[PDB]
């Protein structure tokens, strides 16, 4: 007779105390820049929406990022633009500094600013147990930032981190998943990289909300501390929630899906099985021990619970004593 209802334990109500033009995103009409003030110098990259270029805007010489929509319903792309315009200004959040559409061909565009990135296979080898702590923080005032804007990410993970580390600059990009949160809303599961899935997308339970940005961040945590990449590394859906039991262990799962009277797939009942709550040690090695600590093991205990209402939120997060030394080092 159904699944038990969720709500967000923080910035519950946020959306509804604003103008409907700020999260009905479907009503906002695209101001459209110059698309000749912008000559592509070369590509960056791809994705499943899109091709990211450097480029030049031509009036004042500046280095930019062109991010070329492939087709996607316009409802995506209008609600991209307005979480970014949303955000604009927010700490670490990626700048839009523009969005043009080629004249003839009528794809749309969208400029952003340019960061001095360091790809992440050759910079997180090099960083030290203090550049993590410090890079970590700097996530969480991202994501404090566009959860306390009413707004979930839904795909944070390394490849959406761009680092200049010679400034020590972190910037939050690709907002195309990004949804606004709504107390009641049923979100679609079929989002994120599959290394960072949080259970409720891999059981199917859609009442989810900001705390799923605080799973997929104690993934990377994880994996960042422990040097493996990627730290639940599933086959698939299925095995990924498996190979989640196999280290929180199935009491707290089942314990999750009988709190919220959740339907498990039939499929699950075969794969599951009985798995102990492993101890953090067990990934532990002389080669990634400088970078753990119990400081570092507590917080990531606290960010990697199955019950999205037990996870830390994201200013809880930034008063662990992982962070005290960053945080004194700020002031
Ligand atoms: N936004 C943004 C942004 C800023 N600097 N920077 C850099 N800087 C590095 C020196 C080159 C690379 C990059 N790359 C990619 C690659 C693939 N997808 C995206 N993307 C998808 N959706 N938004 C962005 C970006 N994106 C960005």
């Not at 315009?85 to 969005?99: F, K, Q, S």
């Not at 009413?150 to 390394?158: C, L, N, S």
């Amino acid at each position: 007779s159904g699944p038990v209802p969720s709500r967000a334990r923080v910035y519950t109500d946020v959306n509804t105390h604003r103008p409907r033009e700020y999260w009905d995103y479907e009503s906002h009409v695209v101001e459209w820049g110059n698309q000749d003030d912008y000559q592509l110098v070369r590509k960056l990259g791809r994705g499943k929406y899109s091709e990211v270029f450097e480029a030049i805007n031509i009036t004042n010489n500046e280095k930019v990022v062109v991010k070329i929509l492939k087709p996607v319903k316009k409802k995506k792309i209008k609600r991209e633009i307005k979480i970014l315009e949303n955000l604009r200004g927010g700490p670490n959040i990626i700048t839009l500094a523009d969005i043009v559409k080629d004249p003839v061909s009528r794809t749309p565009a969208l400029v952003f600013e340019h960061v001095n990135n360091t790809d992440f296979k050759q910079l997180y080898q090099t960083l030290t147990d203090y550049d993590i702590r410090f890079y970590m923080y700097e996530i969480l005032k991202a994501l404090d930032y566009c959860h306390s804007m009413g707004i979930m990410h839904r795909d944070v993970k390394p490849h959406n981190v761009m680092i200049d580390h010679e400034h020590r600059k972190l910037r939050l990009i690709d907002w195309g998943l990004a949804e606004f949160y709504h107390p009641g809303q049923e979100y679609n599961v079929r989002v994120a990289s599959r290394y960072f899935k949080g259970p409720e997308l891999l059981v199917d339970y859609q009442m989810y909300d900001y705390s799923l940005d605080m799973w997929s961040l104690g993934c990377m945590l994880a994996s960042m501390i422990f040097r493996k990449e990627p730290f639940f590394h599933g086959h698939d859906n299925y095995d990924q929630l498996v190979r989640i039991a196999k280290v929180l262990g199935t009491e707290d799962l089942y314990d999750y899906i009988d709190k919220y009277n959740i339907e498990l797939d039939p499929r699950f009942n075969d794969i599951l099985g009985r798995h102990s709550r492993k101890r953090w040690e067990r990934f532990v090695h002389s080669e990634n021990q400088h970078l753990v600590s119990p400081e570092a093991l507590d917080f990531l205990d606290k960010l990697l619970r199955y019950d999205h209402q037990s996870r830390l939120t994201a200013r809880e997060a930034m008063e662990h004593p992982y962070f005290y030394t960053v945080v004194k080092d700020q002031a």
